[PDB]
């Protein structure tokens, strides 16, 4: 089966350089051209660059021309994207796509985040009010980078739970809330932030 596995994504400071790679398997890599396509948060796909099967012809999107370089190693079945002078606008999921002349076959992509933020664990605050159904939650504030996972009562509570997508705050840190409605018992949200090795249990009263 056709396989494309992007890697190399991560958090990179603005102005730094990063190298994305794409491992291809299941087909004759040296016989196909390859594209790079990215998906900024909340936006549609944006084409980035293309490269012929032998690597002699390279075209770039205007927004990345002069900064990005596309290359390939047919002996390694690996496609590359060298990103220089990275900007905040360059944050996105970078996809690897094969073309033919299945018109386009895509990998799962790798995430690139351009930010000056330092890895930071989240602050967990309770959400309590001050009628049958009631509502409680947790405010996971000022953490970086994505993601965080939130359970309730160690996973014993799932019905009625809503963990909202994080929003990017002016400070460069992320913040989200997790809420659950209950019939008007102990309630504890469990916050997990892998990047900082932070694990927090907070009861709500």
């Amino acid at each position: 089966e056709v396989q494309l596995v992007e890697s190399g994504g991560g958090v990179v400071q603005p102005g730094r350089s990063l190298r994305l790679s794409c491992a291809a398997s299941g087909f004759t890599f040296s016989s196909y051209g390859m594209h790079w396509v990215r998906q900024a948060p909340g936006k549609e796909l944006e084409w980035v660059a293309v490269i012929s099967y032998d690597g002699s012809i390279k075209y770039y999107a205007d927004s990345v021309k002069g900064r990005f370089t596309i290359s390939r190693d047919n002996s390694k079945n690996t496609l590359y994207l060298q990103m220089n002078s990275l900007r905040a606008e360059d944050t996105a999921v970078y996809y690897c796509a094969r073309t033919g002349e299945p018109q386009y076959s895509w990998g799962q992509g790798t995430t690139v985040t351009v930010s000056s933020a330092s890895t930071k664990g989240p602050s967990v605050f309770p959400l309590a009010p001050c009628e049958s159904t009631a509502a409680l939650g947790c405010l996971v504030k000022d953490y970086f980078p994505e993601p965080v996972t939130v359970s309730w009562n160690s996973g014993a509570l799932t019905s009625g739970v809503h963990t909202f997508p994080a929003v990017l705050q002016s400070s460069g840190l992320y913040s989200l809330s997790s809420v659950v409605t209950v019939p008007s018992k102990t309630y504890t949200c469990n916050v997990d932030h892998k990047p900082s090795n932070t694990k927090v249990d907070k009861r709500v009263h």
Binding site: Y95, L127, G137, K141, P165, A166
Partner: protein, 211 residues
Amino acid sequence: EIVLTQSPSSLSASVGDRVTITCRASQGIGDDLGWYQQKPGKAPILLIYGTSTLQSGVPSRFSGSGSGTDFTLTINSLQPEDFATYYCLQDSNYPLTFGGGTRLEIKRTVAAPSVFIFPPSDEQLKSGTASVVCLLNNFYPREAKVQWKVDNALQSGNSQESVTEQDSKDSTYSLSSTLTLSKADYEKHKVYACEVTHQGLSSPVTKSFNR
């Protein structure tokens, strides 16, 4: 570049329905337009290319038509797995360009939101920041309006909203609005009110508290 205008940005349908999604090029692109399907956290999958040529394995309920500048995606008899986001794609020239996308959501009866307001925790106040959270729980359709009033003073530019994906059980959405103030600004006002406008409510509902 060749700009693709996709319509509509979202669409409501039911299983078994027939769906039509439109995409217009700012200039002639012949028949070099395809259609992509994507779901949250998944890579796009090509469904149709060459205007009308259905890619191997794609169900026959998918079909493309039109040539020149206007292009259409049609899905006969929707299936539960078909609810996702669709994009048109053109590779006639460089750069390759994509449409805005169309989020195809499950249509459902109108459901008013449950509204809750949470004051800022005392723990957070010790830090110098105050977050007031307003919750719109399980409502439909997705469109809603939340207005923050602090002592009857309409707030602007100091809140962020977050919407969940359409629920897989009841097909509703949920939304959070967060008013962010500093400890100083917050302690200088008494009543914090969240007014929610939704077509499931006979009139807007206001949840509030006195600090």
